[PDB]
Amino acid sequence: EFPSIPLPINGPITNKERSLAVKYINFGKTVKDGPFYTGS
Amino acid sequence: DIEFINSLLTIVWRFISENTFPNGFKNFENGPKKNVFYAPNVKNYSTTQEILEFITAAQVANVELTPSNIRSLCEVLVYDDKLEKVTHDCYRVTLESILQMFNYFKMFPASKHDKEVVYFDEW
Amino acid sequence: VMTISSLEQRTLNPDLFLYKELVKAHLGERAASVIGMLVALGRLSVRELVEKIDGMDVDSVKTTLVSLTQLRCVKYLQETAISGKKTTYYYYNEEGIHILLYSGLIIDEIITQMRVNDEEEHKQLVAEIVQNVISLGSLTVEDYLSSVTSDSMKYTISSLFVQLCEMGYLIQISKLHYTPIEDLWQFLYEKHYKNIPRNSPLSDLKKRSQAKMNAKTDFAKIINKPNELSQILTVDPKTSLRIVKPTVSLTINLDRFMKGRRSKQLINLAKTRVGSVTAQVYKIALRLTEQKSPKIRDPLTQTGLLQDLEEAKSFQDEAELVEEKTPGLTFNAIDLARHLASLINSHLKILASSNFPFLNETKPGVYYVPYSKLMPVLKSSVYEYVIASTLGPSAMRLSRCIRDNKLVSEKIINSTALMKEKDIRSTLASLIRYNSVEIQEVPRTADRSASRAVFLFRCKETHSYNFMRQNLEWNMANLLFKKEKLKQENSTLLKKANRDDLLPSELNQLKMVNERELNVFARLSRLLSLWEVFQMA
Numbered sequence: 001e002f003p004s005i006p007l008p009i010n011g012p013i014t015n016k017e018r019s020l021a022v023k024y025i026n027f028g029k030t031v032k033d034g035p036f037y038t039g040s
Numbered sequence: 041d042i043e044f045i046n047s048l049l050t051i052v053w054r055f056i057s058e059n060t061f062p063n064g065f066k067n068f069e070n071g072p073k074k075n076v077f078y079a080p081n082v083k084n085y086s087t088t089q090e091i092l093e094f095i096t097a098a099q100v101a102n103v104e105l106t107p108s109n110i111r112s113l114c115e116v117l118v119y120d121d122k123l124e125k126v127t128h129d130c131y132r133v134t135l136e137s138i139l140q141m142f143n144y145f146k147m148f149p150a151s152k153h154d155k156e157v158v159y160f161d162e163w
Numbered sequence: 164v165m166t167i168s169s170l171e172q173r174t175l176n177p178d179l180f181l182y183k184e185l186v187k188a189h190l191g192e193r194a195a196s197v198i199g200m201l202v203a204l205g206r207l208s209v210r211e212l213v214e215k216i217d218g219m220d221v222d223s224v225k226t227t228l229v230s231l232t233q234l235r236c237v238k239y240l241q242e243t244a245i246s247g248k249k250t251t252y253y254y255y256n257e258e259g260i261h262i263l264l265y266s267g268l269i270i271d272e273i274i275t276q277m278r279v280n281d282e283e284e285h286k287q288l289v290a291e292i293v294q295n296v297i298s299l300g301s302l303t304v305e306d307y308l309s310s311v312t313s314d315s316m317k318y319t320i321s322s323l324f325v326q327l328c329e330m331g332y333l334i335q336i337s338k339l340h341y342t343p344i345e346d347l348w349q350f351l352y353e354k355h356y357k358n359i360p361r362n363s364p365l366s367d368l369k370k371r372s373q374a375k376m377n378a379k380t381d382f383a384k385i386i387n388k389p390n391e392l393s394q395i396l397t398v399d400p401k402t403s404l405r406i407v408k409p410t411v412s413l414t415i416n417l418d419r420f421m422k423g424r425r426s427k428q429l430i431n432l433a434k435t436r437v438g439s440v441t442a443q444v445y446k447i448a449l450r451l452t453e454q455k456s457p458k459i460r461d462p463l464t465q466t467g468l469l470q471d472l473e474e475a476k477s478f479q480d481e482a483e484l485v486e487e488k489t490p491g492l493t494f495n496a497i498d499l500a501r502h503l504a505s506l507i508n509s510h511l512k513i514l515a516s517s518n519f520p521f522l523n524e525t526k527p528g529v530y531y532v533p534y535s536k537l538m539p540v541l542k543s544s545v546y547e548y549v550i551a552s553t554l555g556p557s558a559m560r561l562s563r564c565i566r567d568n569k570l571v572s573e574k575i576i577n578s579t580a581l582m583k584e585k586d587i588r589s590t591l592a593s594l595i596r597y598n599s600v601e602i603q604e605v606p607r608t609a610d611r612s613a614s615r616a617v618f619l620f621r622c623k624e625t626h627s628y629n630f631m632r633q634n635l636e637w638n639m640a641n642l643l644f645k646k647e648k649l650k651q652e653n654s655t656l657l658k659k660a661n662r663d664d665l666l667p668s669e670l671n672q673l674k675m676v677n678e679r680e681l682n683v684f685a686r687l688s689r690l691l692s693l694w695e696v697f698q699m700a
Contacts, residue, residue, distance in 0.1 A: 001161065001168045008159040008553055010693070011686055012148040021684035023267040023294075030298050031189045036230035039191035041582045072438050079509035084516070117580045120563040121556070126518045135435050142548055143434075153679075154645050155638075155686060159553065161168055163634070163641050 044100065052114065055094045056123065057133040060086060066137060086129045172644070177633060179203060181640035182255070185263050186236070188647055193219065193227050198236070201255040206240075208250055228253070232341070233300040235259040235414075239341040254343050258417050262297060268691060269415070270294055272423060273332060277323075289323050296415055301336045304409035318404070325407050328396065331423070331454045334389055334416040347385065348467040351378050382463055389416065391454070422456045425699055427692070428541060429521070435544075436517045441510045445522070448500040448511075449532070455492045457485055457534055459699045482535055487524075495530045538700045542628060545696050549631070550599075557581070558590045562599055562622070570603075570621040591620075598630040628697050635694040642690065646683050649676065 015021075057066075065073045077083070087094075092107055099105070115125070123131040150156050172180065179202045187195040200207070200215055207215070212224045219227075231237040238254035262269075270293050274285045296302050304324075308314065327333050339347075356374045363369075398408055426449050433442040464478055487493065501507055511530060514522040520536045551559035564579060565571055577583035594600045601623040606616035650657075656673060 003157060003159060003161045005157075005160060006553075006555070007149075008155075008157050009145065009148050010552060010689060011155055011158070012145060013150060013682070014147050015682065015685045017685060017688070018681060020267060020271060020688060021681045023270055024684045025680070027266050027270075027294055027298065028188065030294065034298065036233065037191045038193040038227045038230050040193065045580070069439075076438050076441070079506045080513055113579065116564075116567065120567050120580075121560045124518055130518075132436060134437070142552070155642060155683075158638055158641065161170075162173065163638055 044104075048095075048114065049117065051094070051098075052091060052118070053122070053133065053136065055091060056086070056118075056131045057137060059090070060131055061133065061137070067141070084128075084130060086131045088129060169641070169645075172641075176640075177637050180644070181636050182257075182260055184640055184643045184647070185260055188643060189263055190227075190230060190234075193223065194231060194236075197224065197227055198231070198255060201237070201253065206252050206254060208252060231259075234263065235300065235337055235340060236263075238343045240343055240346055242346075258340075262415070262417060265691065266297060268688065269297060269420065272420070273327070277326070284319075284323060288320060289327065292320065292324075293327075293415075296333075296413075301412045301414050303412035321404075321406055325405065328407060328413070331419040332415050333413050335392065335395060336412050336414050339385065339389060344462045345466045347462070348378070348382070351381065352467070355381075379463070386461065389418075418458050419454055421459050421695075421699065423453050424695060425459070426450065426453065428545070428696055428699075432519060432521070432541065432544060436519060437513065441513065444500070444507055444510055445514055447503070448495060451500065451503050452492050452495070452532070455489065457482065479535065486531065486533065486535060493529065493531045495532075541699075542696055545693075546627065546631065549693075550594075554593065555590065557586065558594060561587070561590060562594060565600070565620055565622040570619050572620075573618060598626040601626065632694070632697040635690065635697070639687065639690050639694070642683055642687055646680065649679070652676070 062073055062077075065071075092111065095106075118131075119125040122133065122136050125131070176183075179199065182202055183195050183199050186198050196216055196219065197212055200212060204215070209221065209224055209228075213219065213221055216224070228237060232239070236256050236259035238256045240252040240254060241249065242252055243249040270290060273293055274290060277285065277289075292302075292307070295307070308317065308320075311317075324333075352375065355377045356370060359370060359374065395407055395411070395413070397405075399405060426446075429449055430442065430446055433445050437445075464475075468475065497504065497508060500511075511522070515525055515530065520540055521532050522530050523533050523536075524531055547559055547563060550562055560580060561576065564576060568575075574583075576587055581587060591600055595602060599622065600620060603619045603621060604611075604613065604616045605619065606612055608615045653676065656669075660673075
């Protein structure tokens with residue numbers, strides 16, 4: 001793209017905390033399957 | 041300008057780091073800095089004309105005998121990137137000694153999709 | 164043309180696109196429609212939402228307000244007029260949206276908070292009830308225990324339930340937190356002003372001392388009732404085990420969680436200037452003084468303050484008196500920070516002499532942490548390390564030497580540490596665009612030109628802290644919008660992955676997008692840990 005400029009880092013690849021995002025997506029799915037959703 | 045400024049900064053930072061902290065306990069973590077200074081004593085000092093003595097111990101062969109103006113200039117140079125300069129001119133290298141060897145930022149970057157740049161193109 | 168670099172959300176939506184994207188991934192699409200009108204307009208009633216949505220009716224608006232009240236995302240405010248016709252009013256609630264924002268970082272700290280009983284109870288006892296409190300809102304005990312059948316181990320939840328509300332998070336439900344901040348002060352500003360009879364003027368007002376000091380008095384027990392309270396706690400039945408009252412429902416508190424979250428930035432400052440073991444004993448001395456701390460800014464001066472300079476001067480002085488006069492937080496003695504001898508006292512003296520403003524102000528020998536005199540140093544020590552990490556260390560040395568004096572001139576930077584006109588004046592233009600230089604010119608002419616003028620470089624605060632805060636908020640809004648865009652290529656893959664709970668191209672499709680869906684949360688947690696410092700005073 002138009003930007004390629006020096007190092008916006010604090011974005012590496014080594015997670016070490018994969019279960020934390022599992023807790024994130026588990027909370028997301030439990031709010032997704034709640035009694036109230038108010039979709040569409 | 042431009043290399044001898046970095047040379048003088050390197051040697052005065054090395055002298056501060058070897059003056060206010062021991063030598064052989066920086067590159068490893070075996071009871072660090074002798075459990076630093078063995079629950080530190082009342083020593084807690086700095087150079088106070090000793091840094092100009094370490095200057096005088098090794099110089100270039102030219103007009104670089106500076107003191108009392110470039111001394112304060114390098115002092116201001118070392119309290120806007122490093123040493124805090126509390127009274128008694130006390131100097132501690134605790135973060136620059138780690139940066140010379142915010143942590144654990146390895147394995148960067150990727151050649152792929154989003155963040156992994158999120159910079160200008162403003163966001 | 165070819166807008167693929169996401170330019171179409173540049174100049175349409177800061178500071179509300181975050182609030183719309185946090186609720187679109189959690190509460191459907193109809194709640195985003197009303198929360199995009201509560202933020203964009205202000206206070207508006209039910210029918211004012213109906214005549215503004217153009218696509219929902221009273222059957223649709225009132226259905227969604229219950230789902231937003233359950234997650235305390237909408238503040239109630241019932242009011243009336245001078246002629247009558249009492250109606251209902253609604254604000255947008257940012258604390259509930261922050262509860263939806265973190266939502267797993269809450270169950271990150273609450274797991275690593277208990278003692279020796281480790282990895283036999285923090286998998287299904289507490290981790291299944293705390294996420295149910297965060298997900299379903301206000302919960303009681305009797306409606307939760309009906310979900311289990313043949314409750315043999317029915318008192319195992321009670322021991323972890325009395326322990327959790329003993330030191331914080333669990334709290335009595337929002338009988339006060341749905342009422343807004345400003346009307347709680349404005350109704351109190353009037354109901355102790357209209358009962359004073361006619362008397363002497365005495366410089367024609369005088370009650371703008373008396374009554375509002377009275378207001379301050381009965382502000383103090385309004386906030387203090389949602390805290391550690393003896394109405395729900397210390398209930399002792401006869402010939403039985405100690406228990407709390409299970410009848411009333413209870414929720415979580417986002418007031419002790421934030422002061423427990425500030426401790427991580429305090430430890431990150433403690434990595435500077437001292438080692439690891441001394442940082443560990445400062446860590447445990449900080450964790451012992453969590454739940455009694457003065458919190459991030461009280462609602463006393465959040466709104467209603469019309470900038471009375473005597474009151475604004477004396478508010479930061481009386482907070483020092485709150486900090487000095489505690490019921491036990493100042494008692495950071497030897498017998499309190501070694502169990503929960505002289506060597507740790509020497510390390511604590513090094514903490515006193517570390518010269519960052521923590522663990523200072525100690526006359527008799529018992530130590531205290533100055534929370535109020537630390538916050539500019541906390542907000543500035545992390546602000547410098549972002550220009551250094553992203554833009555450059557030379558720009559960090561420059562932006563520190565703008566503040567090393569006040570209003571540095573032109574020919575003063577190039578006297579220090581670097582030559583002239585090579586990248587000194589080049590990184591200034593890379594820092595005017597981030598509200599971190601704030602140029603100010605003075606001419607000698609009569610029409611304020613730029614040729615016959617000189618430049619003055621003063622680092623004006625509270626403009627660099629807010630622009631980076633809005634930048635971090637809009638990066639967070641960017642990160643969740645792209646995540647819900649790649650979900651559209653999985654509506655025919657993840658919904659269809661329910662009838663069984665090999666086509667190896669799906670190994671590069673299903674099990675390839677999963678870590679692509681994980682590494683956005685993995686850095687959203689770091690965005691959260693980097694953004695919090697600009698909203699803790």
